[PDB]
Amino acid sequence: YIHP
Amino acid sequence: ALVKEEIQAKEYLENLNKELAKRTNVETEAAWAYGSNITDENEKKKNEISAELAKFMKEVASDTTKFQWRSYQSEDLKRQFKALTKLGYAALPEDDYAELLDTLSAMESNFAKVKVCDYKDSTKCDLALDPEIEEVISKSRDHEELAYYWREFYDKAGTAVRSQFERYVELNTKAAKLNNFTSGAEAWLDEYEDDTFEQQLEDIFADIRPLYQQIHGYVRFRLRKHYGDAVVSETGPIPMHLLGNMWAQQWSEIADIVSPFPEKPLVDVSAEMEKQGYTPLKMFQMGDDFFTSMNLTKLPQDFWDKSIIEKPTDGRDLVCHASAWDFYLTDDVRIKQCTRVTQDQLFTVHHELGHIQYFLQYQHQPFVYRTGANPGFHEAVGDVLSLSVSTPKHLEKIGLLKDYVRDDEARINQLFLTALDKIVFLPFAFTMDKYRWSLFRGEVDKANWNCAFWKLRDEYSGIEPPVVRSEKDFDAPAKYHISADVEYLRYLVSFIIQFQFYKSACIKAGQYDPDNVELPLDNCDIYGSAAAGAAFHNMLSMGASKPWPDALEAFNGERIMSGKAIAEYFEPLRVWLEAENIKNNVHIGWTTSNKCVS
Ligand SMILES: *[C@@H]1O[C@H](CO)[C@@H](O[C@@H]2O[C@H](CO)[C@@H](O[C@@H]3O[C@H](CO[C@H]4O[C@H](CO)[C@@H](O)[C@H](O)[C@@H]4O)[C@@H](O)[C@H](O[C@H]4O[C@H](CO[C@@H]5O[C@H](CO)[C@@H](O)[C@H](O)[C@@H]5O)[C@@H](O)[C@H](O)[C@@H]4O)[C@@H]3O)[C@H](O)[C@H]2NC(C)=O)[C@H](O)[C@H]1NC(C)=O
Ligand SMILES: [Zn+2]
């Protein structure tokens, strides 16, 4: 689950 | 008969879910090891475990046909079985799956390993995106220096993986069709469980688009005063390298030169963070504090023991793009972030901790339900807190913002600063998936793939490359999520729904009343609010056990994704900006870009  | 089978099926699911959690743990460990330490050995290990799990998933999908699950009484059991039929990439033949994995790691490792030469020193060629290149992009106002770093990065992170990206599209399409979706676009869109989802987003985007146009026009106007008309034209797309971000996805780094009222305060707490001796550890502890202050779940010991919160100082290659990780046991959750001591990074910490909290909140759910209500929900959680953290209200409480007077002009500055992040991002995020959808759907000939990217960036965002590009270049994979095959629509959804969450959390906290001048939405701090926390608990604990409108209903009683809340937040800015652009005779809109030659 990653940052934009 | 069916009654006896449904009892049998319930037991089957209970065991299978636990088995899937345990098997996924093993794959996740190998993926974590590779992302933390990129080597040929770790790549091989990651991909081999994935191949093994894919094989098991195939047997699972096959075994579901032994159960008459569509005939069952329990909506819950049917929902679980349906989740198990969805194979994704694992539907591919053994050899095709292995090749896709090799293709995916080739692209992600390429991105992560990019290094460029210093603009001033062709000797020094060890500048990575994070932090060296991003430092220049965010801080330099030398337009030629900026253009140099833009070209070097895009050539290496983008063009270098064209052939790999082409094979990835082929195999992604093949996988989707084996699951009987038309393309990878439909496969991705399936996560939103709504057959009008694209139209819904087009409708919301159309409502907010005029505000973006006003912000765009004003920023261009202000950039002309800074750089002159030789660098920035009145009527053309904005040269993207001047926007303080490698992808021009958010423009807050240039706030100091485009702020409505330059003589009034502009919130930038990075220097105060450094002065007060902030560390990555402190920032994460503060994020933890925010969550617990809301009566939400404390970070477990495994988080602190196992997380990577600073860039390693040894020689090693790794993925520095911030991420949060669920290991599918109990309390084994981790973040990997190459944390720097800045305001933006303090928001990133809270964003990532938002994922972690979601993991902890639903870890009691069956395996298949241990994910977001939809991918947008997962991205929204931490951003709701970050909206609060960003307020002058909160930043004064924690001593990071000093001698701040909150007059009308300072409020406009702060609203504009927020918009440079939140409104500007919307067309950007939409184009990331509009582009990939069009490739997945076979709507663009391979001969036109690069200019199809820049055409969308022009049409929606009104930005363009600093230099002329052509079909000799391939610029899309220069964005992390494109190289790493991470769906991007989740972020568009997030940026819309996070304002729905924020507005409701603020109302529940007694921090927002539309009829009370003392309680504006744009200065709401939900820190310490157990009432806001209760709403989060009610929603997050559900995981993916129910369709997402039921998860939203659990939060605030609503069932519809809506642009009402984001527009409400920015309404004071809209009124001021429309008037300011008229006052200054600001040109709105842009001619078609000349920067991608067909
Ligand atoms: C994506 O879509 C694909 C279709 O475009 C789909 O592929 C189809 O899946 C079907 C499985 O449900 C499959 O149907 C079987 O066909 C067998 C014979 O097919 C052969 O000849 C075809 C040409 O005529 C060829 O195209 C094929 O390649 C094959 O060579 C049948 O023998 C078989 O039958 C058995 O199963 C049925 C189903 O039973 C069901 O369940 C219970 C029993 O537990 C029943 O009580 C209940 O009534 C229900 O019907 C039995 O009725 C029967 O007695 C046999 O046991 C079956 O019909 C089909 O062949 C296949 N391909 C095509 C081209 O149609 C994919 O599955 C989709 N993928 C995903 C992931 O969803
Ligand atoms: Zn995220």
Author numbering:
A (entry chain P): 3 to 6
B (entry chain A): 17 to 614
Question: What does the study report here?
Answer:
Peptidyl dipeptidase A is a highly glycosylated ectoenzyme that cleaves dipeptides from the C-terminus of a broad range of oligopeptides. AnCE is a single-domain glycosylated protein that closely shares enzymatic properties with human ACE (in particular the C-domain of human somatic ACE) and is inhibited by classic inhibitors of the human enzymes 14–17. In this study, we elucidate how the natural peptides Ang II (the principal end-product of the renin-angiotensin–aldosterone system), Arg–Pro–Pro (the BK-derived peptide) and bradykinin-potentiating peptide-b (BPPb, a snake venom inhibitor) bind to the active site of AnCE, revealing novel interactions involving several enzyme subsites. Comparison of the four structures clearly shows a common mode of peptide binding to AnCE.
The co-crystallization of Ang I (Asp–Arg–Val–Tyr–Ile–His–Pro–Phe–His–Leu) with AnCE resulted in conversion to Ang II (Asp–Arg–Val–Tyr–Ile–His–Pro–Phe) which can be observed in the substrate-binding channel. In the AnCE–Ang II peptide complex structure, clear electron density was observed for the tetrapeptide Tyr–Ile–His–Pro. In the case of AnCE–Ang II peptide complex, the observable part of the Ang II peptide docked with residues P2, P1, P1′ and P2′, occupying the S2, S1, S1′ and S2′ subsites, respectively. The main chain of the His (P1′) residue from the Ang II peptide makes hydrogen bond interactions with His337 and His497. At the P1 position, the Ile residue is involved in a tetrahedral coordination with the zinc ion and stabilized by a hydrogen bond with Tyr507. The visible electron density terminates at the P2 position with the main chain of Tyr strongly interacting with the main chain of Ala340 (through two hydrogen bonds). The hydroxyl group of Tyr interacts with Thr387 of AnCE. Ang II is resistant to hydrolysis by AnCE and repositions itself in the active site so that the penultimate C-terminal Pro residue shifts from S2 to the S2′ subsite after the hydrolysis of Ang I. Based on molecular modelling, we predict that the C-terminal Phe of Ang II could be accommodated in the binding pocket.
